[PDB]
């Protein structure tokens, strides 16, 4: 009895797979006016934050000030927004950034007694959920091309740094390969 | 692997748990009106269309030409429809029907080869949709009375009258007991 299986299926094929196709088109007609602008550029990916204690606030900063909210993202109807990385104060790096909501329904289940969902269940699904996410858009059509899974745990933490991590090594990919 | 383990615990904890507690004032709110004009009335509970062949379209008519549009639900934002059931032209029910969306998922998997995900999977899995949904609402605090799961398998039929017969067991049940 794994939730997670299901959980990724169903965050897979009833949202990822409908949204990616347009994101990279969105963000490149984006990315002329940032650019023109602000000389910046958004990452092409969209970056799923998958925190393994499937904590989900409500909007990003409260998780670390450092990331800020910048702009919607058009559409070519899905809302998406644009979130600039500080590092003392100066823009580091943006990115289409989200949570994958299914988290929020393990944290759910762990708070719903009925379910016997403890919270070392709860742990231990959240990286099945990862893991089988992975699986999926690696067998998948340009859609792990599309998107960036970022899993953490936190200790008993950067997030914005973490993001950065990620977005650092994806312009080291771009430029080397 | 069973993704209907997590298809039915994501469809309860992210949704019904969340609609159905503000059911019941809805219904009996519109249930003054619809009274007084049609003299008329709409069953209190959420019926819930689970097709073990996962064919869930973009409207209920075009599933059974006796299931009729009559009104949207009024919040007291979820969009819930009103439906009345017709015997010979004539109303013989109302009540508020939806599909339960997950099965829509279960279908896209069995047209996505790279899921490995046979029609006989399919079935299966939309059966134990059915059984892990029963049990969670069994278990829950009220939502078990505030909705009604209508699972039926199609030969190769009236889906009207399979909701009619939902309807008037459930009036004899309120009757008798
Ligand atoms: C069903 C797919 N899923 N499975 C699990 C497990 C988690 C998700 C998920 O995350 N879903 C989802 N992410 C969304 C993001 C946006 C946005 N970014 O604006 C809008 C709607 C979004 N939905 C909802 C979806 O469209 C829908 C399904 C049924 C009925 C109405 C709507
Ligand atoms: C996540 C829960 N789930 N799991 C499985 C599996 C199927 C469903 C499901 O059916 N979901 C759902 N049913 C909805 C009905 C309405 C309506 N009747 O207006 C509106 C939104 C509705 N959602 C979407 C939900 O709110 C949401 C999740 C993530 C992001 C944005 C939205
Ligand atoms: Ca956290
Ligand atoms: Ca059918």
Redesign the interface.
Same mark, same amino acid.
């Given at each position: 009895?794994?939730?997670?299986?299901?959980? !990724?299926?169903?965050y897979y094929?009833?949202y990822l797979r409908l949204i990616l196709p347009e994101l990279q088109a969105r963000i490149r007609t984006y990315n002329q006016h940032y650019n023109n602008l602000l000389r910046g550029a958004v990452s092409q990916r969209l970056y799923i934050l998958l925190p393994l204690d499937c904590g989900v606030p409500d909007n990003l900063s409260m998780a670390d000030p450092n990331i800020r909210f910048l702009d919607k993202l058009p559409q070519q109807v899905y809302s998406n927004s644009i979130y600039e990385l500080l590092e003392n104060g100066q823009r580091a790096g943006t990115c289409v950034l989200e949570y994958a #909501?299914?988290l929020? #329904?393990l944290f759910?289940?762990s708070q719903?007694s009925? !379910?016997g969902f403890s919270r070392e269940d709860r742990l231990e699904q959240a990286k099945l959920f990862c893991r089988t996410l992975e699986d999926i858009l690696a067998? !998948?059509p340009e859609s792990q091309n599309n998107c960036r899974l970022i899993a953490y745990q936190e200790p008993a933490f950067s997030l914005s740094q973490e993001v950065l991590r990620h977005l650092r090594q994806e312009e080291k990919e771009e430029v080397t390969v």
């Open positions: 009895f794994n939730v997670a299986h299901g959980l !990724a299926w169903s094929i009833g #909501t299914p929020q #329904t759910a289940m719903y009925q !379910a067998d !998948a």
